[PDB]
Design a protein around this nucleic acid. Sequence first.
DNA 1: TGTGGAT
DNA 2: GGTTATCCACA
DNA 3: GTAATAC
DNA 4: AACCGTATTAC
Lengths: 724, 724
Amino acid sequence: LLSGKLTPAQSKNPAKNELYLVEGDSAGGSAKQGRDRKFQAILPLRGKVINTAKAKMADILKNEEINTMIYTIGAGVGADFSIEDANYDKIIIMTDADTDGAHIQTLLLTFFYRYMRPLVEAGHVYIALPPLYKMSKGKGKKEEVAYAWTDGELEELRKQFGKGATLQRYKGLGEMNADQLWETTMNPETRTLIRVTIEDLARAERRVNVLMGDKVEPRRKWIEDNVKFTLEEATVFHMSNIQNMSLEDIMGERFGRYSKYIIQDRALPDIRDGLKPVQRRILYSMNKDSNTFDKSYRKSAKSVGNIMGNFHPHGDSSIYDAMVRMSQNWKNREILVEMHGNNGSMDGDPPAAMRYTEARLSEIAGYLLQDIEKKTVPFAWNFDDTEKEPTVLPAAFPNLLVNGSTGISAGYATDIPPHNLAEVIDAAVYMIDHPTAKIDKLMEFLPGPDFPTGAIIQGRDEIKKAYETGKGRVVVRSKTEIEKLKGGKEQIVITEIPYEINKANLVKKIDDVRVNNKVAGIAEVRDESDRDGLRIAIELKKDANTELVLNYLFKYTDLQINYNFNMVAIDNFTPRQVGIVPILSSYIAHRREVILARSRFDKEKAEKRLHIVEGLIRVISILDEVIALIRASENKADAKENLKVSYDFTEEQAEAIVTLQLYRLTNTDVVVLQEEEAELREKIAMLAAIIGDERTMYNLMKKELREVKKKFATPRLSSLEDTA
Amino acid sequence: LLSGKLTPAQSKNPAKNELYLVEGDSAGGSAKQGRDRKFQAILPLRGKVINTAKAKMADILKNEEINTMIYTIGAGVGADFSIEDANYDKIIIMTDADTDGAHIQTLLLTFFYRYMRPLVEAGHVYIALPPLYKMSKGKGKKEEVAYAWTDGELEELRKQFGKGATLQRYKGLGEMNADQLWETTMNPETRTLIRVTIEDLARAERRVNVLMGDKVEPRRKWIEDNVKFTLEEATVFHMSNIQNMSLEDIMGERFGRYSKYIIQDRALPDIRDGLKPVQRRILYSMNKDSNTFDKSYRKSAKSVGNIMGNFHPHGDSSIYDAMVRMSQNWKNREILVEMHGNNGSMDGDPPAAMRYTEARLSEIAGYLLQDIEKKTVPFAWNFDDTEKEPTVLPAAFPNLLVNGSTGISAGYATDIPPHNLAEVIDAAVYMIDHPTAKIDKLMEFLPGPDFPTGAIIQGRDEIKKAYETGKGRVVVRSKTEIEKLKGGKEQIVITEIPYEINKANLVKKIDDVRVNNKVAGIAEVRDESDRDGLRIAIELKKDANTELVLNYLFKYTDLQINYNFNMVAIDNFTPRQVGIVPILSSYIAHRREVILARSRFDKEKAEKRLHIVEGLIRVISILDEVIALIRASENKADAKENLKVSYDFTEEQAEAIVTLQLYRLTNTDVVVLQEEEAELREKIAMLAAIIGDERTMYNLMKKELREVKKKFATPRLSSLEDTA
DNA sequence: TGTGGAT
DNA sequence: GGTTATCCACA
DNA sequence: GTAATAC
DNA sequence: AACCGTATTAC
Ligand SMILES: Nc1nc(-n2cc(C(=O)O)c(=O)c3cc(F)c(N4CC(O)C4)c(Cl)c32)c(F)cc1F
Ligand SMILES: Nc1nc(-n2cc(C(=O)O)c(=O)c3cc(F)c(N4CC(O)C4)c(Cl)c32)c(F)cc1F
Ligand SMILES: [Cl-]
Ligand SMILES: [Cl-]
Ligand SMILES: [Mg+2]
Ligand SMILES: [Mg+2]
Ligand SMILES: [Mg+2]
Ligand SMILES: [Mg+2]
Ligand SMILES: [Mg+2]
Ligand SMILES: [Mg+2]
């Protein structure tokens, strides 16, 4: 039931037959359609293959996908592996030419290396190579489709005696027709493979264990030593026919590519705006489409489709789940998306699918995007070079700390808990005035996290350690109170639970305590929560020891947990473990760049208008000459030329004069224009002084942070305690 | 496994407890969140409930949803039904306030009427009424939100505290938050219910059997007698508290609403453009978004999400599957969508989901939309009154016959097979010249269907009957050929199969014939089809009788089938069974309206431009005076007034003069404007003649249809034979 | 075991 | 529309 | 026992 | 991403 289904070849022939291991059932379908059914079999992989270096050998051998591979190859598994029983001469791995494709290659290669080594050794395991590019279009009798695998092969194809043709940049196998798949990647005559060889059993064994073994620290080290976070990779001169590569180099190049991508571009937040790329794209796309807080909700499926088609070439379930999370006020301290409909619950009940719900950006989310239209932040080409997207948002509140981040990458993970907006701003403002400020002083403004689920955080020293180093362990404990009853009876009443805990599962875990009588005293467990309030009632038997029961429950259920800070974020393209000081100084440095770039943008605009207004006032004095000149001129371009040469107007002034509508000649009021010149000069002065003076800039930064605080501040929800 | 999961009430209490039967798991989730958990239980319904009047009893008691309803109510079924054992005092049906909601009510009420009648009889079965409208005035005072169920309650709310207020039109329970659901529809204090009463067991029994029984003809008749296809329905008038209604009237109102909707707005094509609403929306939306044949493909999920958000308030799987079908050249003779990726196959393998594929309109589909921008076709408000959509497309080729339609409605179905485009145009052009043309003569141009799957159609007389009446039965038979082998030995080779037949299932069925040895002689069945062509090989045993085998197979497999024509389409809002004559004359009448409206649009545009050009020629002769005049004027309106009074320009001319940009005075070439005057006058004359003379209009209609034919004609694929 | 973006 | 897998780091 | 738009 | 239900008409 759980594995890809094998489409076998029509005829047995272990001399020639090929098993295609295909990334995904949909591309598996295309391969089924495009293949030569006589000798090529198709086994689709349902996403990420089990890591056979990490998992246990019972567990590996109860994995459906692995079993159906061992069945099909018909040769046992290593120890019992008879290459002379093998049903194929080639096992051909065919994935997307993308980073998750690279990962899948890695995982499969570790299975073959670890349990079918003769197969690898004999050079029977191959890879793929789909094209990255398709060029050209000239109708039916076509003369205008070729394919390319490198930028250099692409440059070659651009030279075609034609003009501009069409270029497709392939994102995956799922954009290719079965004809195209066969021609480019499955036909022995025309495909390009990589034969995987072992050049050195010792260097291979090392490289596979470091990349794919249980131990993080060597993999982290390998990544620090090998991955170039601030440089692109050069990428191979694509050789045709077959081309050998060592298991060593394939594993290193593939896992390097994947690692770098999921570190920088998936699971870890940017230190400045606090966003993962998917979250930033959600916000930018919704904002670009005017799906803001002040306008009506818009069908989720529409938002998600625009996000996917314009910015984020990944599954809609990934996009939609991230958008839903941004709407849930038990996950985010300051929700960034407002969602009508079933956006889930603290019981973890499934949110309605995107066909049902509708959404827009929250008001505070607009503050993440404030001044994105004023060239405040670096943009980059989207995935297919049709549109630009921000690499970071202006971020007028410090979202990294306010909403936190929880992610799992390669060689790194991150847990940054949420914080109270007012308190974070208070620390930031202090640090604007005192750049060398120390943790003890900062903690007067920012004493600890502020979970949206409230509860009690215990461990002042551990907060401090986390704020210093990025790592610490604190206790988070449910808010409880005792309530008397009839019968000489008490009940424990829970009104706030720990962050990230599922209420329904907690209730079940507590009820199992009672059922198994692990501790004595429990009469009944009732969830009495409703739409207005969380309320769990643990009703105790007559003369139960309520302290014994409550302490048992703190210890052995998630009624209390440990929260481990592991504060990692992307800073200068590279993952970095950070305390509060780097977090806040990065934010400040970011706001500095934003305010300066905004001020330049606005000043340029005001100067252009000023120069135009000066030109219009001058035009009055020479109106008859200007009209005559324009009438004499051959066209618009010529008229402007004559204005500059004859009368010393700038380009911008000349463009403005020649595009005036005739009816504007009714107005000869220079006084209103002079008033505007003066207003513009005042503004330019203020903007120039912000650019020319660090302290003027910093004082504007504080004024704006204080405004955000005043508008969005809410009371702290979690209480802080020192020890137990 | 297959049923909605019950969320029970906390405390048993048959006096007060309520079972909510909720349309869909997602709204079931919202109901779970919004309820009062003490007495309200939630049983979600997974879509359409089994029709307990139609289906067997084997099937009814094998149905998971029905069984879990019987279980939960706790009162046996039918014969053994004890109302004093019932676990709820109220069974409350809560659906979307939409047509499929109405259908679900209908199906449930038939179950309770037939197998829990005492429950209905005692007035314990109710229907929750969700609001249609929410009215709001944004952030502020308090947020300010009231609800409405009728247009009259809506009109009231417009006054109330409304003016600069936003109105949400609810499309489903899926757009409501759990607190909104409780306030409006689940709280006993504030909800409005309908108690379902039996006023008359005899009238009820009849009304349930006609609407829900397996006999179509009475239902068809009931629909003809009761449903008003060309009138709106009256508003309910919504009373407070509970309000009783007879099972008779409920069933009639609800099933009438459903019937009309799926007849007019779902399963049946419009006779003019040949489209179902979902298909027309796919085309209009993709065309509006510039997703045409000449431009880059676009991610399917983007198209689909725009279609859903702007036009088609239904599931993405419905939309995407319809788009995919429009792309499959074994379903459509002239594909309307071009789709890259896995768009399925003749084996029925699942198309890739919308996250993988990308799409655009085909070139010929552009001809369905030609001149949509020239006020050629009636538009109507979309589902939420934000955007207009066409009720029918201009349709520059007769798509109803060319691409056909297969559909299943209420009381009616449709099968219209595909046809060859050139042939259909030939018939249409003949009929333009010979309005009273008869079937025998039309069939010289249009001899029969042309399936995109080819094969052999047999039964000339039955084609003629179908072309006369809309109904007939023809044989469709696979194209076959014999091939010799070494061993002397023969094989039957199939290269074309019947329309709508799955190849893989046919192959399997033939192989079962071999295995069961129903006819002597079959050695092996092999599908040897590949990307370049269909080829199924039936290898016979030495000295098998080819003809005996082939005859067995035609008779007892789908290697040959009957195609039953049942040509139903919507004509003047009403379903109608139609032969070729009404189909073609409707088309012609449609193109007449289009060409006339286009000609009026273009003529009006030319006349406006002509008047402007006349004024611009006059301006040039008095340009100095005009510029001086404008300079003497106080403002735009004064300048125009001075132009009218001093020089007799019209309003339109004056507005055009005074909004000229100064650079436009570089071009005062009166001869070029005179040339333009002449060209415009010639065009107006041509356009006027089309409007003033039917034959001029019909000649243009034929010229255009012949151009389409010349561009898009392809040879016949199906062969026709006279005897079956 | 479970967190959250991915296949 | 629920259900069912995997990866990755870190308790 | 399957077709195609719906839940 | 496969797999699994139902309505509706008509063979
Ligand atoms: N849970 C619910 N599902 C459906 N529903 C919708 C489907 C779709 O939109 O494409 C679909 O393909 C589908 C397949 C099914 F097999 C199916 N049934 C299997 C049984 O468990 C349910 C159901 Cl019901 C299905 C619904 F429309 C509403 C629902 F709440
Ligand atoms: N067939 C394939 N599916 C996945 N895949 C994608 C999911 C998603 O996009 O949200 C998902 O939620 C999901 C759940 C699963 F339980 C699941 N497995 C159950 C086993 O049968 C497979 C798989 Cl694998 C899943 C894939 F990414 C690629 C696929 F080909
Ligand atoms: Cl101006
Ligand atoms: Cl003009
Ligand atoms: Mg991919
Ligand atoms: Mg998923
Ligand atoms: Mg604990
Ligand atoms: Mg609905
Ligand atoms: Mg479906
Ligand atoms: Mg037959």
